[model samples]
Target: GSHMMVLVLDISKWQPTVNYSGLKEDVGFVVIRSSNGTQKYDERLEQHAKGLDKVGMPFGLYHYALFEGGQDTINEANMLVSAYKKCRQLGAEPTFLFLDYEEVKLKSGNVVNECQRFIDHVKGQTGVKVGLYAGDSFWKTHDLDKVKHDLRWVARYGVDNGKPSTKPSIPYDLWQYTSKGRIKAIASPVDMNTCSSDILNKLKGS
Candidate 1:
């Protein structure tokens, strides 16, 4: 299939205030970090979701995983679902949900199993499409292939010039090209990504 690459930006509490109108004009989509671990929620999640919704920008939510066992992953999944519900209550419709699985200092439990538990719990509860986000090396080292997901967002930052110098060896739907990306709508450098429209449409459920 012919695919069109689209620019994407990801934000978290670090990007507290954003010019949504400007951002909408600058990028094709946005992914907001919704929560972390089991107890902490991103301080700016509601603000970001509201601002993006007002601008009619397509957006999604991601959870930063910090798992130590099966129950931990379940709790984290619940936290993500709560964040997603909060966004929905505020009239912000997210395109998808993603599990950001980059934690490397795990003390116990298999990461691949933990990730699958999180994905299964979230999908079973919300019925929303779920994707996996991980650094290229981390994805392989942790055996993330065993985790079930609807799509893949691979982070392989080889360049900071807003263009990817190389692609991930594993199949990926979205590539996070750089973390030192600058945009007029954001005050600080942000994570920049690129995805084929074919993948974007799948995430959007079209």
Candidate 2:
């Protein structure tokens, strides 16, 4: 059997700007950061959405998680839904919504429960597929495997290049291999990802 991989890129306000025209040719899809914690929506969320829409490139949204407790997770999910709606209102459609769970300030509560809450709320509110984005160690440390999600995006940057030397332990639909990847149209290095054809089809709603 042959394997098929699709290239994906993720960006946020930190990137400031992008060349969507060239980006569309470089990757199959893009993931944009929409919100952080329970508040603070990405300042560039709408602009990035519009840019990608103009080029007819499929994109998704991700929320940087900061789940301190059950209520906080719900609040964050609601905020993410709001941002997704805003983008849709601008004629930008997202294929999926992902909870970026990389860092947390308070680790006292049940992290897995918090993740489940966010996933449930976001999927229920928008009727959009929900996914999880976390590093290998972060996922294991938080025991997030217990959370049921539409998809999983695992980040394990072994070489900081397009190819990763080590794979994440958990089963994942997508793998973020590098954060220092350079592509045409983007002036700075950006996060690079690869996924199987099945995962790409899911993200593309095919």
Candidate 3:
């Protein structure tokens, strides 16, 4: 936990070619997702993660969930678990199995419940910790109180401008603090961040 906090950026839509060289070296972990609007982006993510591992960053991968595609709940579970297994087999030791659904409007006309089911399935099968992605207001609307036991990687980008929003949630372990942060490892103003707890100590095989 002595190392610096974690930072996650979505290289899913952008090429990670820039080397941010103006910030601290302790910028430790990153959770990356595949590019938007592409099914092939799932496989393409391994290549990117492998590329990143060579450069010495602890990398993780995530999937954008589908509100309706599989036969049923179990089928949906199977599909996502298969993808996570594939990524894990390919050497992407995702510290957090991210389920990114920011108020999705699925084909079934449901909002984000499909994502809730998917993340639960992923955790039940893999035994790996699941992290839900959302902005602050999105969290309130979704009312993930039942699943708050899982990690909530809330994305609140209020730069030291004013006090944090009223009644900020605290059960979260990490915060996606800012997006326009000037870091050193990544370039072009990546999302800079910090940890909310000493979960790093627990990550050392705890």
Candidate 4:
């Protein structure tokens, strides 16, 4: 069997090195955090985008979803679009975008509506791929698959071993198997994921 696993990075103080060609050959893709909440951009977004593009790595971007209410949700989606657009304007082309919904405090009865609003807004603005990035704890609170997202990225950190404790039985396009994954090109622990070919094709626009 052939499998492809990649990495996702955020605003960590000590960033990964730019030897992403190591990743391009092995993983073939990367996803970086573009924004969080309403106004805060991930500090390393620009650098990550530039570094990944420089190495010719096909990539995607995500916004950490902050569910406050109707108005806040709308604002958050717009900000997410803005961040990805900024990256493109500055010459990094992220083929897909995602909404990272993990805050427990934001889970409410209207979560479905809020999430839909956010995804819908981003889709309208970017017309690129859109999906969900949520951990198991976040998955337990809501039926994220039921929302209008194009795909799912579920996170579950298992044993110290290379594999996750339990694979997701539900439907998903990608899985973040561990938060403590190691890549020689990246000194710090990086989030690791297995992405389906559908996602890879989406990123490549093929």
Write the residue-wise lDDT of candidate 1 on 155-202 in tens digits: 988756766666788888999988888888889888988878787677
Model 2 alpha-carbon drift over 4 Å, by segment? 1-5
lDDT (Cα, tens digit) per residue for candidate 4, span 52-154: 8888777888888766876788899988888888888779898878888887445445666778888999999889878887876667678676687777778
Q: Extract clashing residue pairs from model 2.
A: none
Better of 1 and 4 by lDDT: 1
Candidate number with the higher TM-score (1 or 4): 1
Report lDDT (CA) for all predictions.
Answer: 0.86, 0.86, 0.55, 0.73
Collision count of model 4: 0
Error of 4 at 89 (Å): 1.6
Query: Candidate 2 at 162: error in angstroms?
Result: 4.5
The lDDT, on a scale of 0 to 1, for candidate 4 is 0.73
* Every model's TM-score: 0.93, 0.93, 0.72, 0.87
The TM-score measured for candidate 1 stands at: 0.93
